[PDB]
Amino acid sequence: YNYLFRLFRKSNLKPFERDISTEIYQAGSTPCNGVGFNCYFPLQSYGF
């Protein structure tokens, strides 16, 4: 679980863009308050 990728973002990356952000991702029409259902941590692991 030491390797991760970003599963979601508010818009697609530009060429050679980099984004370290750990901010919570709002997956639908729900207020997430920076903290659950439709309110996910956007970094996820392959579990190789």
Partner: protein, 49 residues
Amino acid sequence: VYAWNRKRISNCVADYSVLYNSASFSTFKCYGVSPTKLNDLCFTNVYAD
């Protein structure tokens, strides 16, 4: 669970947002396709088990 009911979904418009925006579920997931993209995609058949 030994005898699941299957519904065949066809000839209709499918508002998946009524599912994915609803807080009515203990878990919701989609695989190979993003749920917000299912409001754009169109299919020959759909099935619900």
